[model samples]
Target: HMNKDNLRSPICCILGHVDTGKTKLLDKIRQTNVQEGEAGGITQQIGATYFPVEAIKQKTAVVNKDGKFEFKVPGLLIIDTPGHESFSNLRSRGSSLCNIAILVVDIMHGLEPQTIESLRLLRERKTPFVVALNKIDRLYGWKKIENNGFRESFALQNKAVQNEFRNRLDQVKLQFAEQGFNSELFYENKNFARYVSLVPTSAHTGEGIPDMLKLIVQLCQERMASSLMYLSELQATVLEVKAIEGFGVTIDVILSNGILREGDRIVLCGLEGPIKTNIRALLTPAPMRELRIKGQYIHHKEVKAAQGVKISAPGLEGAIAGSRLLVVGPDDDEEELEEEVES
Candidate 1:
């Protein structure tokens, strides 16, 4: 159909050092409290959160006072990955999958080993990223202002607190410069194409979180606009295969490049070979609900790309995580699908 109107959400990712608080930071953005419950406080597998455009507009309503920005993409698919150095392979895979990312830098510690490594990964993968100067609440005498601009919070603080905030921010800026990147605060950043936006954030106090999301949406809408166009081919990745109490075996998938429908025969990479089957059912979380949480999944007869979906099919026990799932369209041949899935 060659329709350019279907602009999918820009797939996003969060990456940084372990102690930089990426998960807690993600919990804040997700409005959940599962960070501490994660085994040993580390992410073992890649997680995706599908935030629709309406929710984005609602969360950033106060922070986006200028209000000139219009929502284009359907939403944002945020991929959470292990921030540890040992999980470098997983981080690289996460990096390659995301269209953009947020690199967290603990303001107290500046750029650490993993922080620098993530920047390099972004560069090598040709992905745009913003710097989250997280934990500004740790700044001396800084006050907590929920659902407000960071500038407002900065203004309420005493002169010494303001000075300390600026010093930390400046220090991080210089550190990024040393690492060959120019950056500025989100509201003050003029050249989105040149300078990386620095979002002063706090996972605990929920400061600057809205601005971070807004900046991400802005970057995607303004810079990566054309790239979000709906591709004509079906492409998806298997995120996880789970057995629910009643649902039996189902695989959670994030389809990034094309539409998928119920009854469509799909080929998935498996433990031994391709697991070819038809999509018996496709379910997604009700609107504005987190994909990883306990919520109701609405059934869809036809599902589109750039969002998370739970696929039900027979003989899916062999499906592997982080594998590809391709729909066998009438125009596509099975042998070529095999070639594409294998080599």
Candidate 2:
């Protein structure tokens, strides 16, 4: 049950200044073209969306004027936050809910106030993040460049563009140094900062999204996924807080590892302390809830991986957001039981 590969899967969160193009960047990575229609553009609300891609293929959708997109491979999960500072609160108090982050920055605008704050938070939390230099096409007379590696033609042939790129890199290094951190381009150093990775990308034209995702998967598989795979106790994070009409409050949880099945008694840490309850129901992508509590048969099958699901239980009182959850054996007594005489 205990192996190094158990808990290593990396969960990446995206945070940056508003309008710096975090949503567009995510859309680019997910290959969503929803940005073209909206006046404000792409992301309209706050909720986590997943992109699972094993590799690039024709199933990848193109960015259209209507902003519709889809993926055909197992890919990275991108958690989009409103602004960069939200991570400040999330990173502190040992959340670590996210393993990596992509900080979207406008090349023309350079680093803004929120960018500096995001860098500080990433350093403070020791979380790795790649700097996505977004909107490169916005540069003077720069044409639409698609999927350019480290060397785009304009960047390679034009001295001004080359200087601007290097200058931005220099600025990044200096800022990091000021905060007692180190940074380098993703291609330059395998390890940037203590745990940061910088990836230059363009959300507007879908350039470098694939590479960014590839780097994320490589880093996660090599480093984070194993840790998650080995956690024996079933632990998960509350991704969304929702209110259900009949069932009361239902929270969607993303299981990091360990197996969760019907009839498994669980304890969720609440505002006061841990609240014990049995898993009343379980739901999967099938659009229905399964209420079967079949035996060791559950163990025979492997659903052991990271996934999002809805859970129901009794005594869910005070199950606040951002609390640690743990699974306990069914026989474990939540309330102290009285000793009984043998019959």
Candidate 3:
């Protein structure tokens, strides 16, 4: 059994109104450069990306004013959820499948109807989130500063540009206030646990992206360390079910806690009752590839928590999407586990 000292990567979801740059932001993070290929410049389906801690360190400077900061969590698995009505269906067991959420809001557009809906869903799921005020580069006369910090970048912009930024921020704050949330810029907020922190960002120029990642790491460490600690029992949620040419039927799952091994007996929540099956294989996406891509999976003997994985099993035809699953040990009480899952 893994101990509490073992930390798992945090699962994050990016959501907002259409054309708010959710997928582009993910592209910028993963360095995938797939934004131009997206049809109509909008994400049509949900996509997940894995960013290992080493990759994050190489892409962004995770350091404090005093010195460098080391990340305890392994990495981040970011889910770029569709901005349309499809987001409302991304729930599991009446709650969100994400540990943290990034609410992307267009700085120029302020809070739109879909942005409000995203906020309502996040609040309803009790998922803490950071507001990404995207498209700061679109401000009037805004200039991209080289190596300038977030605050310094804003300060060096033209006075008119700065005013525009402030006006947009004020408007967002007002909208958030109406929703009963007190928000402030990430740099200005001393206590992030008490008030919501909003990070000004530009997916185009990559400004504030480092700060956004840093804030996520900080928040997860400070507020979610206990919840993210490793558990002994396997607990995962099915994100989607797919039928591949060679693999037949498989379920893409986000392993939230514990470890899953090949050939482990598992119980998946079905439409009517729990379905019992044995894992035929445990497959994970190759580096930089997503689980949705068929034939890109690499088999694994065992996988740890906080990862996006695909499971191959013979009796998974009845497994439902957005349902929970647990690994059943040989000595475990099957009836007790079934009753717990049912309730």
Maximum-lDDT candidate: 1
**TM-scores for candidates 1 onward, in order:** 0.92, 0.70, 0.89
lDDT for model 3: 0.76
TM-score winner between 1 and 2, please give it.
1
Flag the better candidate by lDDT, 2 or 3: 3
Q: State the lDDT of candidate 1 residue by residue for 39-135, as single tens digits.
A: 8887777777788788888878777677877877778888887877788887887787788899999999999998888989988976888888899
Error of 3 at 98 (Å): 1.6
Q: Residue 27 CA error for candidate 3 (Å)? A: 0.5
TM-score leader = 1
Runs off by more than 4 Å, candidate 1: 1-5, 287-296
